[PDB]
Ligand SMILES: OC[C@H]1O[C@H](O[C@@H]2[C@@H](O[C@H]3[C@@H](O)[C@H](O)[C@@H](CO)O[C@H]3O)O[C@H](CO)[C@@H](O)[C@@H]2O)[C@@H](O)[C@@H](O)[C@@H]1O
Ligand SMILES: [Ca+2]
């Protein structure tokens with residue numbers, strides 16, 4: 135036929151063509167989360183949008199390295215140094231440092247998350263921006279692990295609305311990756327998710343991440359159509375645009391027929 139038929143039952147993921155000045159990287163907003171609260175982050179409504187009803191702590195823009203790898207301090211005989219969780223032992227020490235005098239159960243202040251001074255032990259953050267596929271095909275996003283709770287959403291009307299990156303969060307719970315901490319503890323059922331994307335369109339991307347205590351971990355990757363994997367550093371793939379709610383043609387409901 136002269137034209138492609140389109141994805142079945144309007145199945146294509148909504149994308150965007152923002153006309154304004156493109157900025158490299160994602161915006162990261164930080165919100166209050168209570169130390170050792172092991173329940174709030176288990177609710178889908180909280181992880182999709184309820185986080186923004188808590189106090190906003192601040193923000194950083196232009197972030198291309200988006201994985202989280204926060205290690206608490208070990209106050210050791212030779213000074214205070216971050217302890218990789220796999221090197222923690224006993225009650226407690228850190229391999230190569232001896233016994234640690236400090237508690238694993240208190241808040242710690244650091245700039246480890248995106249250079250922003252906060253409590254990485256206990257915080258929720260929202261990463262927003264647009265993913266620009268260089269290749270048409272299936273993209274598989276993944277979290278290698280999650281400590282404590284996280285979601286990833288892709289698409290207009292799923293992550294956020296086209297040309298409206300800076301607005302309060304939308305209520306969609308149709309997550310691309312549901313990494314929400316189960317009520318029974320243990321691992322979420324599935325921490326990949328796949329999206330079919332068309333080259334050159336901008337796909338809204340949202341990651342919401344929470345830590346309640348001590349270590350924080352969220353190693354983010356994407357497998358491209360060509361089979362290669364991009365991990366941690368998404369430079370060249372993620373961008374931000376200032377809101378333009380007046381750009382009438384911004385939303386592309388079905389990129390295969392655009
Ligand atoms: O999944 C929850 C967190 O687990 C780890 O945090 C540690 C965890 O400690 C456990 C025992 O070792 C402690 O003696 C006991 C005392 O509170 O708690 C158990 O759950 O939980 C503590 C908080 O209660 C933390 O202080 C410990 O660091 C770690 O993987 C965290 O990143 C997880 O969020
Ligand atoms: Ca919409």
Ligand SMILES: [Ca+2]
Nearest residue numbers: 281347348349
């Ligand atoms: Ca934790």
Ligand SMILES: [Cl-]
Nearest residue numbers: 229230231232
């Ligand atoms: Cl040691």
Ligand code: NA
Nearest residue numbers: 203205218219
């Ligand atoms: Na770590």
Ligand code: NA
Nearest residue numbers: 207214215216
């Ligand atoms: Na430290």
